[PDB]
Symmetry: C4
Subunit: 210 residues, 4 copies
């Protein structure tokens, strides 16, 4: 139990990294998914004898709905496993004792927001690709693989790099929104990044000043 | 009356959004504008026998100027409705108790400043267009609609996206000033955005701690 | 003498604005500059028997060397008039009483640094006359006036706009250094702008609350 | 004694500047670094009979490994002289006594981080070059030196300018990543730049008001 919470935090990080990635990119390893589901089942079993009634009124419903496999496009239902983040949200008391832990958690949240926005950006680009104006076509032209098209690794790296540059307000000019949906998404990302800097990069300075 | 105050704030936000838009874009529904005008007349009616003399020498002239209809250019004279913003600026104390409502108001005023600057940017672009130089011609080339050029949706979205990038200091490089009026406007927006952005988001970071 | 300090401040701002501009751009009105020099001579005269030795011991040398006419590329010596800028520094005792005055003065210093860096940037870009390389040739190509070349208005506005984009860290994309001297100057501008952003726009965030 | 270790700080800055530059750009004079290592041998002799065992227990081995000559990948082993900054890290009491000294040291470490990132960026670009995609090819085609190729001066200046623009979040658009390795390096540099820029310049803004 002493190291169970940090293992669950790592598990939540893994699923937060690889669930939106699998939804956006790979939908078009399984054994690791089965292993992590088994570990979360073990966790919920441990969570349970006069206190089980308290758990039932508490977070039992959310953990149960996030732990039940949905196998019977059914692949979009796997998003429900993103509900495991409530475990980290509710156990913040233990995850706020060390300064290095707080720094690592802040970078984890920053990288996760960038990753989720990258998945959304690729979703938009791939939705609009079939119907020379989108960012995917320009990327393929500028990396020497005209639309075939860029490999999945190239698309993910470009999406993450664009999202990081927009969040950090560098705006490299390599990747620029050109369609109305891309422009509106970029406006939303600019607003999100403004709020995220005002919070996170003030907190980081304040707790480095410690 | 508190519900009435919040309703008046909502209508003031609506007019601050839709009268500069109509002045900049739509010149060359209205029933909602008429309804809002009737609601504002209702507000100036409920505003009022002992206190009537007190208010008559107060803001009443300002409210009257922003309430009279100029339906005898009429379109540019209809911009007098922007004076209703004092109806919100004069009782901001009623909008400073929730704490998070102040954050919402700061986000709203940042978005409103961006929208007004977008309308000014489009006004400059349209006043220069008839005379490959200019943001409208470049936008028409990029978007795939060479100059009748881009639709009003594309023009407004591009203007708002450019203004947001300039205020947030991203500088995407998709749209960039190229004419002397555009360059001077961009210098003014750079100064104004630095000053505002710094003030607004310093306040936002301050209220995040609470 | 009650309002003489503010008038002298306006004259100092004028000379700071217009001496580097004449040194860089116009070298290739006189009456206003002559009137300003006469007014500065009047200023040193009026503020001059027990206290004469006090002035002789103090700022007499700097005030004198910044007031003697240089008439006899000899106009390059007129840049010594920038030593009059120390008068606002030594009268910051009174110029700092009002918060609005402090904010206006901070914006003035920011704009003056941008203007001086614009003059230096144009000077650097104009040293490369003997040599599609350099910001002046790119500027001429962009605005449809290939080298003739752009007018002095276009050159000054473009230099000021590039300097403002660099200092604020927007980097619009039209103007970008392409020569080792330009790149090194841009690195220096980035260092100076980081130093001033840490100073000017932290002090502004402190001042606004005050 | 203070003059001695301030000279040692200057020597440490010299070697931190000139070790990665020689390791990366000149992999294809020795009197200065011979003098520097002789001076550091003199320093290790000064550092040492009662206290000799005290130093032997402590920093003796760290200072010895960074001072032993490596003459006998063979030329790459000289990067071990980059453990010498522990000399200035271990004695921050003197170096941080003055506020102006801390300001100068913060500027120096920011410039050093930019220099190291420039060396890494050039190493990546050079390892990718012999395989219009790389940044070196674009630099050569934009500077007027088609790939021969740009001189070492041009390559170093361009790398340093790109690194400074990325750290300061300008993103000029002249140099932008176009390969997966370059994009990953840029993402990591954006995270690093956010952290170091925020920490360093929060410290700077704390210092200036003092
Ligand atoms: C990082 C980040 C994420 C989201 C929003 C903003 C907006 C506020 N955010 C403050 C730091 C600024 C900054 O880092 C900077 C400003 C001016 C500079 N001028 S200069 C000549 O390049 O040194 C350099 C850096 C950039 C804007 N930010």
């Amino acid at each position: 139990k002493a190291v169970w919470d940090w293992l669950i935090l790592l598990l939540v990080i893994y699923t937060a990294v690889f669930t939106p990635y699998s939804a956006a990119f790979l939908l078009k390893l399984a054994v690791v998914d089965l292993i992590v589901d088994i570990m979360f089942i073990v966790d919920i079993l441990i969570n349970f004898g006069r206190i089980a009634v308290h758990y039932f009124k508490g977070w039992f419903l959310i953990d149960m709905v996030a732990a039940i496999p949905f196998d019977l496009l059914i692949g979009l239902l796997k998003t429900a496993r993103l509900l495991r983040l409530v475990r980290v949200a509710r156990k913040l008391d233990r995850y706020s004792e060390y300064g290095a832990a707080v720094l690592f958690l802040l970078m984890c949240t920053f990288a996760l927001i960038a990753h989720w926005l990258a998945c959304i950006w690729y979703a938009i680009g791939n939705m609009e690709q079939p119907h020379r104006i989108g960012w995917l076509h320009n990327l393929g032209d500028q990396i020497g693989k005209p639309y075939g098209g860029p490999s999945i690794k190239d698309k993910y790296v470009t999406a993450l790099y664009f999202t990081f540059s927009s969040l950090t307000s560098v705006g490299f000019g390599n990747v620029s929104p050109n369609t109305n949906s891309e422009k509106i998404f970029s406006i939303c990302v600019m607003l999100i990044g403004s709020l995220m800097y005002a919070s996170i990069f003030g907190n980081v300075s304040a707790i480095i000043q410690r």
